[PDB]
Design a protein around this ligand. Structure first.
Ligand code: RBF
Lengths: 98, 98
């Protein structure tokens, strides 16, 4: 299911960035560690996703003193809205089971 | 965010069907109750989503002795796979926070 994995990777990448500004290799390390090894992102997958997020204003980038990525203001608020509504969804689903 | 609401509604509808075969009005009642009133689905929204799920083999339909909908075999397994991987995602996200 290609576009569910895509969605999953998006959420994860945004959450890494939420923890702090980071660069591609740093992100890939953090995701591999937090996933107990089960998830090893390809450098190129990150460039594809980051090209799209930048265009949509959700993230921005800049150079160290190596390319760093940053969650924008829009990006933070979009994450908050997403977490809020998906949490409603999770409780609705909880009420359907019992 | 049109296509996130769409995704949310999909998950909810599939979970209703997971609880048991149901018909459009019954589903809408159950979702409104489980959502403490915050979520009132339109009859037409359900037809749009159910047309797509049927085509993809995820659900099927039949008449009572009124149209009933049913999660297919594929449908159940797809739900299980989705719940499993999103649960990995949730734990990965948990490790990134602390
Ligand atoms: C920020 C966030 C975004 C999510 N996005 C999706 C999604 O696009 N599709 C999906 O099926 N589940 C998503 N989920 C998980 C969802 O709440 C649910 O656990 C699974 O969809 C299966 O129940 C998301 C969860 C979080 C916390």
């Amino acid at each position: 299911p290609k576009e569910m994995l895509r969605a999953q990777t998006n959420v994860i990448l945004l959450n890494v960035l939420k923890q702090g500004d980071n660069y591609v290799y740093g992100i890939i390390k953090q995701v591999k560690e937090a996933s107990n090894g089960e998830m090893e992102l390809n450098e190129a997958t990150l460039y594809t996703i980051f090209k799209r997020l930048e265009k949509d204003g959700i993230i921005s980038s800049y150079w160290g003193d190596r390319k760093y990525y940053r969650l924008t203001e829009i990006g933070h608020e979009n994450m908050r809205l997403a977490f809020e509504s998906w949490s409603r969804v999770d409780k609705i689903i909880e009420n359907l089971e019992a």
